[model samples]
Target: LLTAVVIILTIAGNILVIMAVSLEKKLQNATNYFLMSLAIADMLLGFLVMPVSMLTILYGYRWPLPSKLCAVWIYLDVLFSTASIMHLCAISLDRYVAIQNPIHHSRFNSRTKAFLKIIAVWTISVGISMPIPVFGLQDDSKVFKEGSCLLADDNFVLIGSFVSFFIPLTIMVITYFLTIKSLQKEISNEQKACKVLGIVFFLFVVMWCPFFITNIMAVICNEDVIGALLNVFVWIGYLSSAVNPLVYTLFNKTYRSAFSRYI
Candidate 1:
């Protein structure tokens, strides 16, 4: 029931974001272009990643399908999620640079550049994540007979978590921190933009850090850690899917006004 609620609401919220962005031409600009990419990433996560993961969690991590299907699904789970996190950092950098250098933002971050950045984000994310599926690293053996897959396994889990979760989170943290610091010196709309972005990135970190730590602990800690509790943490991280659209509504006036028309 809990997982179901998470999936339903995440899908719903992300759909709303997509609809609002697509329908409102006024929302079509460089800043919102990056947000549209972010929404796409979040949409993929909500529909493809979170629903399956939620089912796995609710079903005690059992895949009713064959091993090949399971491997593909898990590979996608990693890929889309990596894309989502990487996309968030990309969006933050877009905002930070735009706010910090308005003239340059106008010159460089035009529609063409925005689309190129989106392409680059998807390319890099998929480039890094596509190997696991192709190499058969996501084999059926990742799980014990009991069916849970993610673990403290030194070769896969620890390394995978670091590459997929830790590195991106750390980059976003450091970059956003510095961006906020730099923004403190600015005045006018730039300051407001930075402050809003700071809130978004800060929320992103807080939402995800627990899952990273939980996965790390699961990597090394044996028997002492509570698996159900870890599930809760993972759920929270996954639920970041739904929360992002809400954050946009709360922090972005344009999005808020557009969303209100539907409400």
Candidate 2:
């Protein structure tokens, strides 16, 4: 039931945004393109990853399928979640460029360039997430033992956490700060951007901090606490994807109107 509710909310919210960006002629810009890509990532998480994860949870946490599917599951899981973060970073960068350098923004912010940025976001996310399962860092036996199918090497988790979470998070913070600092003409616009950035930063920390800290705890303490909280952490992460569209809708008037069509 919990899974069903999550699946519904995730799909409904993201699809609303996607349809809003698609059907509404006004939203067919580079910024909405990135947002649509973000919705795509989260939607894919809802469609592909979440179902399998819930199945694992329902079935006593052991993977019922063959061992190879385990790798595929982990790959999709990391890929989409990391891709979502990358999209968030891309959105911040897009806004930063648009605000700081409006002249060059026109030069570089064409559809082709935005398309390339979206490609790079997924490419980099996949690259950062692939080394663990692809390189045999996961312990297959532990999947059966602990009901956590996506277990990876401690060293790999440490490095992956730093690369996937910390680096992007730091970049987002710096990008928002620089964006605010670079704004010259419009104090009102600057304040609005800062408010949006504040919400983004707050949601990011609230949603993801637990998972990363638990990851680090696993590395440092080498205890079962991480394993014990694995389900909780994962659900929290999934909840972030579910909550993202609400954030976009509430903060952006355009999205709110676009989203109101179906309601």
Candidate 3:
């Protein structure tokens, strides 16, 4: 019952964000949208990733499909989550630069440059997660165990978490606070975006921190961690995707007005 709620509401929340950005004229002023790419990731996670994982949990974490498909599913899962985090990092850094020099960084001021940065984020995400499917396809042992699909390798988990989550996490939090401190005070898009995106990223980190720490502990503690508890952490992280749109609704007038009309 709760999984269905999470999946449906996750897709619904993110799709509202996606539609508001894509279709609303007022939301065009909603630029510097690293949120754009992030929403895309979240929506895709809900659309493609959630249902499979939800079913897997229902099936008692059993591998209900072929090993090849499990590999592909894990790849997509990592890719989308990595893209989400990397985009947050990029947004913070890009916003910091833009806030630093309102004139010189008209580059970040423009949609084109932000889109370029987004492309770079997506590329990096794929590059990081690409090896999962590659190695899994080569030998299913890397991705499957006891008739279930899971990333079995501890080394990859550690490095992948740091590279994909922890490293960017520090960069994001530091840059975000720095951007907050060096506020431009213009009451323009720059200021509004920071606070709103700040909360969005805040919720993201708080929601996901437990999952990553649990993941790392599972590896460092020699994998003796509680499986069911880990599932709870993972689901908490998954629920984060659904929360951002609610944040926008509360914090952003442009998005809220658009959402009211669109809904």
Candidate 4:
């Protein structure tokens, strides 16, 4: 019930977000383009990836299915997960650039550029996780544990996590702060942007850091971390997918209005 609830909320909320961005012309800016893309990514995360993990959960957190499919599962998981981070990073950097050169960036920013940026983001995401299939198919042991499906390569985990998350996380934060600073100086739209940034950044960081931190630290220190604890942390991280809609609905009057009208 809990897993279904989370998955449904993630899917439903992001579906509404997708609609919100789609039907409403007011929300059709470049940043909102990223928001829509993020919604699609997270919604897919909910629809495609989360249920399989939920399936695993039903089977005692073990891989009861064929080992061949586990690599694809991990691939989708990493792709969507990396996408969220990359979208956020791209959003922050894009906002900073738009802020830095409002006329140039905003004027030049068309659906063409937004689509290109989205493509670039997904390309980077796929490029990062592409190795999982290679490593997994060659040796199922690389992806399939005794009974569980996990990426068992510590080196890959470290490198991939850094590339997919931590490094991008830093870039997001730095660009976000730069965005905030510039907003304060130039636009005085600081309150709104600050609130949005703080909520998203803090929630994203809080939700994701635990899993990566524990996963990486355990790899380094050679700790046989508790499986249950790791599972809990991973679910916590997954819950981040459902968070953005609430953040948007709660903070943005336009989204609130659009949602109200939609429903």
Question: Which parts of model 3 have CA positions greater than 4 angstroms off?
Answer: 29-33, 184-198, 222-225, 248-250
- In model 2, state the lDDT of residue 12: 92
- Per-residue alpha-carbon lDDT of candidate 3 for residues 1-263, written as tens digits (9 for 90 to 100): 68889988888888888787788666564252667668888899889998988888788777777769998999999999998878767766766776677798774466667678888989999999978977889998988888977889889999899998889888888887777777744457766676676677778788989999888877687234466668889988898888865674557667778778878
Structure candidate 2, residue pairs in collision:
none
Query: Model 3 misses residue 253 by how many Å?
Result: 1.5
**lDDT (C-alpha, whole model) for all candidates:** 0.73, 0.79, 0.80, 0.83
- Residues 154-225, model 2: lDDT tens digits: 676788788888888898888877876776445576677678777877887899879888877776772555
lDDT of 1 by residue, 104-131 (tens): 8777656888788889988977876765
Off by over 4 Å in 1: 137-139, 143-145, 151-153, 186-195, 221-226
Model 2 TM-score is 0.88
Residue-pair clashes per candidate = 1, 0, 0, 0
Error of 3 at 28 (Å): 2.2
Q: Candidate 2: how many backbone clashes?
A: 0
TM-score of 1: 0.87
Off by over 4 Å in 4: 186-188, 222-225
lDDT of 4 at 199: 77
Using Cα atoms with residue i matched to residue i, what is each candidate's TM-score against the true structure? 0.87, 0.88, 0.88, 0.91
